[PDB]
Amino acid sequence: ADWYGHLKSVTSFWAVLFAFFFPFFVLPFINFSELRRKFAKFYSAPYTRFISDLLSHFVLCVVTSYFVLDKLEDTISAIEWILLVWFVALLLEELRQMIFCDGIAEYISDTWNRLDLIMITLFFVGFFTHASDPSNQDSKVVSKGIHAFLVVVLWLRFMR
Amino acid sequence: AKTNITALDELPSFALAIEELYKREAKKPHSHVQRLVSLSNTDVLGRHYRGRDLANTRAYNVLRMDQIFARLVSKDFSVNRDFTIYDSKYDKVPGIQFRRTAQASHMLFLWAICLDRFRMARHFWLIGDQSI
Amino acid sequence: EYKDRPFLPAPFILLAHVHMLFMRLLRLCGVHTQEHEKIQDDETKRKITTFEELNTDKFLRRWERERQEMLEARVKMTNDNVVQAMGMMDQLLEHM
Amino acid sequence: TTFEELNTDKFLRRWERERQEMLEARVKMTNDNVVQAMGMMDQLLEHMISFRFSLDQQA
Amino acid sequence: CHGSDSHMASEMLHSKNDMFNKKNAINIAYDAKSLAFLSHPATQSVIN
Amino acid sequence: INALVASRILERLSTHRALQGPHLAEERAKMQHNAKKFEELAVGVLGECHGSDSHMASEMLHSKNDMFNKKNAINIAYDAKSLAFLSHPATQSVIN
Amino acid sequence: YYALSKNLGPKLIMMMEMMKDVSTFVFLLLIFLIGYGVAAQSLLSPDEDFSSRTFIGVLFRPYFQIYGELFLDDLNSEANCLGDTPFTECSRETVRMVPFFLAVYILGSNVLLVNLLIAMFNDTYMKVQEAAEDLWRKQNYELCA
Amino acid sequence: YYALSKNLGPKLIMMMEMMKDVSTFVFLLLIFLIGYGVAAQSLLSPDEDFSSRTFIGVLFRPYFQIYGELFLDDLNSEANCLGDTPFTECSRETVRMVPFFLAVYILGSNVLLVNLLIAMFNDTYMKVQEAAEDLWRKQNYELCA
Ligand SMILES: CC(C)CCC[C@@H](C)[C@H]1CC[C@H]2[C@@H]3CC=C4C[C@@H](O)CC[C@]4(C)[C@H]3CC[C@]12C
Ligand SMILES: CC(C)CCC[C@@H](C)[C@H]1CC[C@H]2[C@@H]3CC=C4C[C@@H](O)CC[C@]4(C)[C@H]3CC[C@]12C
Ligand SMILES: CC(C)CCC[C@@H](C)[C@H]1CC[C@H]2[C@@H]3CC=C4C[C@@H](O)CC[C@]4(C)[C@H]3CC[C@]12C
Ligand SMILES: CC(C)CCC[C@@H](C)[C@H]1CC[C@H]2[C@@H]3CC=C4C[C@@H](O)CC[C@]4(C)[C@H]3CC[C@]12C
Ligand SMILES: CC(C)CCC[C@@H](C)[C@H]1CC[C@H]2[C@@H]3CC=C4C[C@@H](O)CC[C@]4(C)[C@H]3CC[C@]12C
């Protein structure tokens, strides 16, 4: 009941996903409460934050998968810049939850946080390998070689 | 009091006696029988159609309760009652004395299942027939 | 964990991060949020207290009733009752 | 009807016989019988002590 | 019933009752959602 | 041998065409029960014999009986379809 | 038409019960299949525009490799390795990691997931066998009716 | 001649007990084998008079594909697809559904049915092991006699 945010109609994957994608068409009608208040209540629910985290990580996996399958250009591409911004944002979120929420011991105890550090580390090595010499063919092949390891980990972060 | 409906006027004295047992028990505070009858959404004859004096003064007649129990079992349960055998013209029939006491037993049986009194239920179940 | 996580998803969490930094700057230099919450009334607290106390008494009565109906416990009670029965007969003969 | 009624009576007699032969039920019956036995001894002593007061002290 | 006379018990389970809509006991049992009654060997023997 | 023969006769009689009928039900049940009891006695004495002196018990199981067609007890047991008797360690030791 | 049989009918009810374990196996495999497929297709063919053939290659080879058909001769041909040993004397040194990824992958799929599916089916069958027999006995009357 | 042995004899009795589970597996597979075989043979070879070779092809390839021998190179040759990717650049667009049908089929046969056979054998063995030992002990005297 705490997971779903004290609601009774949006209590499955499809219902919360459908309401999440179409906010103005399913939320007024399917009102449970066990307009503004309901909107403020649904999106603060923990389940809704999971579905936002799930969709975000799924797009990250699809976009990064497309980036590693498609050929690298002779300069840093637009999709590469988007992924750079995304992984800095991920790195800042990991550092904030380390330095300013639980503690360094509590963070490193979790196995998924260690996997998160490995992901961020793999992307930055591969990026800097490509970005050091963007027109070099050898730099592109090595960069894709490091980014192969980067994609398997993203698909395991779905196990979480 | 006399009623214009021919089905409720055809009922025997003991049917009114079970109606009295339901009525006396129903007047108690927080009784589930009243809640069941009110939430049933049926008329005086128990049909699912949802004047007022007949619907409140004789709300616990056996035909309506039979309909409520029938809806509790399944969607096509329909218990058949035959009160015509309680008239004095059928006294010469040999086996009628068992029939008249079995049917009677059955409704009392149903009342005892409603109020959740297992011992009284077992006794009326034993008196009648069609045990299984 | 997902109660405390910001709503905004990952590519856009930077907005959430700068918003939290803005809240820290507003809190450390002229605080005006005050972290206001909601407090339950005394009537509903006394209702919860009454319910919990009543069910505590009900479980203890039920638990006591359950332990006295166990077989092992029943056999022990017959045994001490029989020993007390012989004791009562010994004092009876003495009187006889 | 006769067959069903006869077998209903037979199952109820058999069921009653089966529940009284369970161990748990047997232990409960010995227990209430023993408590009634002490009760009967308490009223017996009372009669014994009453008889002692009634006769021995009368002489 | 099945212990005493299997054939007459079978005859009993097939009997149409006047009180309800001429439904036998197996139809009643299915309507009562009695899994224990339906899985019994006597009932299964009549169904077979 | 008599206990095995007795067990076989009671089990076959309990399912025979001449004991079917509404009034014979309790009787039938009783025969099955008694059959089982006789089977237990045949196994039990055999076990006792094997416990006391294994070689003499083996000598006992090989003995030809004049009353029946010079059949030993294992042949009788097979004819009585006593799975419990045949699976016993004493009987298996003599068969080996 | 097999539901009438006393052997085939309850098994059909249990097959419908195990379908959730089948779905669990599919969700866990999907993770390793798409991860390994994107990685392996990128290592085998760097420098190629994305097309429909890239997507087939990602779905195609990783799926059949879990049934024992290992396309190692075909992967040797695609990797442009000219050595007698299968993954030596290649044009790019990165493509020599393809058999390693593959090894991990089949360790994940055949050794770990398939045997866990066997374990889930044994547990699931022992749990719901009696309920399946009872449900088949109710369906015996339903089919007769 | 193995019935005399205390290890091999009871196992032989249990093998005869499991034969019903083997028959159950055969009846369930037969459904998927003939369904997939008729569909796959028709997709691979449209426009061909029915003959004995059509019937062999329906029985032949679907049966061995359940033992891990996947004739994907042979199906690529029969489909007349000339692309580097196995099921691209074909004459007919319908024949590209043959690997999909096949995927479903081996999911039905290897993933679902084989593991259910493992589950039925474990349950069947635990159920009839003691009865098999007792029956072997009666057969010990029968063989001696
Ligand atoms: C824990 C896991 C994720 C560690 C992953 C390590 C990866 C990113 C590193 C470790 C060693 C690296 C390899 C070391 C040397 C070479 C040879 C060079 O000519 C091409 C790149 C290549 C083939 C590298 C590719 C990337 C590589 C495989
Ligand atoms: C996953 C963690 C635990 C272990 C990772 C091991 C990885 C980094 C190792 C295992 C085998 C390694 C490969 C073995 C041999 C060669 C050939 C050489 O000419 C270039 C590097 C290359 C291609 C290696 C790259 C790194 C490699 C793939
Ligand atoms: C008991 C089990 C787990 C043993 C595991 C065996 C592992 C360590 C073996 C099996 C297959 C091997 C690979 C086979 C071929 C090649 C290509 C070569 O150019 C570099 C090494 C590399 C990539 C090997 C790395 C080590 C490897 C992955
Ligand atoms: C069984 C249900 C649940 C799903 C059915 C999926 C079917 C209809 C889908 C899955 C994969 C699909 C094929 C994928 C790609 C191609 C190539 C294209 O050039 C023609 C259509 C064709 C050949 C598709 C036909 C339809 C297809 C077979
Ligand atoms: C976890 C498991 C269930 C993943 C399932 C993978 C499925 C979706 C994959 C595996 C093999 C794939 C097929 C392989 C090749 C072809 C031929 C191509 O011309 C059209 C698509 C088609 C027909 C693919 C459709 C999708 C497919 C059936």
DSSP class of residue F15 equals T
The residues, ordered by sequence, that sit 6+ positions from G43 with a Cβ below 8 Å of its Cβ are: A144, A145, A148, G94, G95, G97, G98, G101
Reading the block at residue A14, the tokens are 């499809």
- Closest ligand 1 atom to residue A146 Cα is 8
The residues, ordered by sequence, that sit 6+ positions from D48 with a Cβ below 8 Å of its Cβ are: C92, C95, C96
Distance CA(C1)–CA(A98), nearest Å, equals 14
Distance CA(G16)–CA(G2), nearest Å, equals 14
Distance CA(B77)–CA(G40), nearest Å, equals 64
- Mutation for testing the A interface, residue in C1, C4, C7, C15 having most A CBs under 10 Å: C7
DSSP class of residue G111 equals I
Chain H nearest-CA distance from F78, in A, is: 8
Q: Does D50 touch chain C (CB under 8 A)?
A: no
Residue G46: other Cβ atoms inside 10 A: 22
Q: What is each CA distance from H38 to B82, B101, H34, H69, H90, in whole angstroms?
A: 62, 68, 6, 19, 21
Tell me which method was used to determine the 3D structure: cryo-EM
Q: Does E32 touch chain D (CB under 8 A)?
A: no
CB pair distance less than 8 Å for F83 and H144: no
Backbone breaks in chain H after residues (C–N over 2.5 Å): none
Phi, psi torsion values for F71, nearest 5 degrees:
-100, 135
Length of chain C: 96
- Mutation for testing the C interface, residue in A6, A60, A87, A96 having most C CBs under 10 Å: A96
- Chain G segment 57-86 residues within 8 A of A by beta carbon are 58
Name the E strands within chain C.
Answer: none
Mutate to test the pocket of ligand 5, among H100, H109, H110 (most ligand atoms within 8 A of CB): H100
Reading the block at residue A8, the tokens are 């009774």
**G99 CA distance to ligand 3 middle (Å):** 7
Reading the block at residue G39, the tokens are 């990685």
Entry resolution (Å): 2.8
With an 8 Å CB cutoff and a minimum of 3 pairs, decide whether chains H and E touch. Answer: no
- Closest ligand 4 atom to residue H96 Cα is 23
Angle made by CA atoms G134, G138, G142, in degrees to the nearest 5: 155
Q: Does B56 touch chain E (CB under 8 A)?
A: no
Largest CA distance in chain F: 50
CA-based nearest residue to A9, from A43, A42, A44: A42
Distance CA(H106)–CA(H70), nearest Å, equals 10
Residue H115: other Cβ atoms inside 10 A: 22
The residues, ordered by sequence, that sit 6+ positions from B98 with a Cβ below 8 Å of its Cβ are: B129
Q: Does B131 touch chain E (CB under 8 A)?
A: no
**C89 CA distance to ligand 1 middle (Å):** 94
Distance CA(C70)–CA(F64), nearest Å, equals 56
The answer on whether A97 is annotated among ligand-binding residues is yes
Burial class (CB in 10 A: 0-12, 13-18, 19+), A65: buried
Exposed e or buried b for every residue in H83-111, given b needs 16+ CB within 10 A? eebbbbebeeeebbebbeebeebbbbbbb
Q: Which residues line ligand 3 (CB under 6 A)?
A: G 87-88, 96, 99-100, 103
Burial class (CB in 10 A: 0-12, 13-18, 19+), E43: buried
Distance CA(A128)–CA(A27), nearest Å, equals 45
Q: Does G133 touch chain E (CB under 8 A)?
A: yes
Q: Does A82 touch chain C (CB under 8 A)?
A: yes
Cβ distance F46 to F57 under 8 Å? yes
Subunits close to H (at least 3 CB pairs below 8 A): F, G
Residue type at A50 in one-letter notation: F
Phi, psi torsion values for G69, nearest 5 degrees:
-85, 95
Distance CA(G127)–CA(G23), nearest Å, equals 18
Burial class (CB in 10 A: 0-12, 13-18, 19+), B27: exposed
Distance CA(H132)–CA(D47), nearest Å, equals 71
CA-based nearest residue to B114, from B50, B68, B48, B74: B68
| HSE value, Cβ hemisphere, 13 Å, CA-based, for G98 | 32
The residues, ordered by sequence, that sit 6+ positions from H78 with a Cβ below 8 Å of its Cβ are: H44, H45
Q: Does D5 touch chain B (CB under 8 A)?
A: yes
Distance CA(G79)–CA(G74), nearest Å, equals 9
Reading the block at residue H41, the tokens are 């043979």
Cβ contacts (< 8 Å) between E12 and chain D: which residues? 3-4
Coil, helix or strand for H81?
Answer: strand
Length of chain B: 132
Reading the block at residue H7, the tokens are 């290890």
Place of tokens 């509903």: C44
CB pair distance less than 8 Å for G53 and H20: no
C-beta pairs of A48-55 under 8 Å, 24+ apart in sequence: A48/A5, A48/A16, A48/A20, A48/C7, A49/C2, A49/C5, A49/C6, A49/C7, A50/C2, A51/A16, A51/A17, A51/A20, A52/A20, A52/C7, A52/C8, A52/C9, A53/C2, A53/C5, A53/C9, A53/C10, A55/C9
Place of tokens 């097309």: G51
Cβ distance H55 to H45 under 8 Å? no
CB pair distance less than 8 Å for H86 and G15: no
Q: Which of G63, G64, G125 is facing H123, going by the closest CB pair?
A: G125
Residue H138: other Cβ atoms inside 10 A: 18
CA-based nearest residue to A144, from B59, G136, G94: G94
Residue nearest to atom 12 of ligand 2 (CA): G97
The residues, ordered by sequence, that sit 6+ positions from E15 with a Cβ below 8 Å of its Cβ are: E24, E25
The DSSP code sequence of H87-137 is TSSBSSSGGGGHHHHHHHHHIIIIIIIIHHHHHHHHHHHHHHHHHHHHHHH
CB pair distance less than 8 Å for A44 and C7: yes
Alpha helices in chain D (DSSP H): 2-20, 23-55
Exposed e or buried b for every residue in A18-38, given b needs 16+ CB within 10 A? ebbeeeeebbeeeeeeeeeee
The answer on whether B111 is annotated among ligand-binding residues is no
Q: What is each CA distance from G34 to A62, C39, G53, H72, in whole angstroms?
A: 10, 50, 15, 21
Cβ contacts (< 8 Å) between D32 and chain C: which residues? none
Burial class (CB in 10 A: 0-12, 13-18, 19+), C88: middle
DSSP-assigned beta bridge partners for residue G90: G81
Comparing alpha-carbon positions, the chain E residue that sits nearest to G142 is E30
**A97 CA distance to ligand 1 middle (Å):** 29
The residues, ordered by sequence, that sit 6+ positions from D13 with a Cβ below 8 Å of its Cβ are: none
DSSP-assigned beta bridge partners for residue G81: G90
The residues, ordered by sequence, that sit 6+ positions from H87 with a Cβ below 8 Å of its Cβ are: G56, G60, H76, H79, H81, H95, H96, H98, H99
DSSP-assigned beta bridge partners for residue F83: none
Distance CA(G106)–CA(G99), nearest Å, equals 10
DSSP-assigned beta bridge partners for residue H81: H90
Comparing alpha-carbon positions, the chain E residue that sits nearest to D2 is E12
Residue nearest to atom 22 of ligand 1 (CA): G94
Comparing alpha-carbon positions, the chain D residue that sits nearest to C86 is D38
Residue A62: other Cβ atoms inside 10 A: 13
Alpha helices in chain A (DSSP H): 13-21, 23-26, 36-42, 46-69, 78-99, 104-109, 111-132, 137-156
The residues, ordered by sequence, that sit 6+ positions from A108 with a Cβ below 8 Å of its Cβ are: A114
Phi and psi based region of residue A77 (left: phi greater than 0; alpha: psi -120 to 50; beta: remaining): beta
Burial class (CB in 10 A: 0-12, 13-18, 19+), A59: middle
- Closest ligand 1 atom to residue A153 Cα is 3
Backbone breaks in chain D after residues (C–N over 2.5 Å): none
CA-based nearest residue to G27, from G111, G117, G115, G119: G117
Q: Which ligand is nearest to the CA of G108?
A: 3
Distance CA(A58)–CA(A51), nearest Å, equals 10
Alpha helices in chain B (DSSP H): 6-9, 13-26, 32-39, 52-57, 62-73, 96-114, 118-127
- Chain G segment 93-112 residues within 8 A of H by beta carbon are none
For the Cβ of H142 lying below 6 angstroms from any atom of ligand 4, the answer is no
- Closest ligand 4 atom to residue H104 Cα is 1
Cβ contacts (< 8 Å) between B76 and chain E: which residues? 21, 31
Cβ distance E47 to G140 under 8 Å? yes
With an 8 Å CB cutoff and a minimum of 3 pairs, decide whether chains B and D touch. Answer: yes
How far the first Cα of chain G sits from its last, in Å, is 15
Cβ distance G41 to A69 under 8 Å? yes
- Mutation for testing the G interface, residue in A152, A158, A160 having most G CBs under 10 Å: A152
Distance CA(A33)–CA(A31), nearest Å, equals 6
Residues H134, H135, H138, H139: is their CA dihedral positive or negative?
Answer: negative
Name the E strands within chain F.
Answer: none
Phi and psi based region of residue F18 (left: phi greater than 0; alpha: psi -120 to 50; beta: remaining): alpha
For the Cβ of G93 lying below 6 angstroms from any atom of ligand 2, the answer is yes
CA-based nearest residue to D7, from B118, E11, E31, F14: E11
Residue nearest to atom 1 of ligand 3 (CA): G107
Reading the block at residue D7, the tokens are 């077998």
CA-based nearest residue to G60, from G71, G47, G49: G71
CA dihedral F5, F6, F10, F16 (to 10 degrees): 40
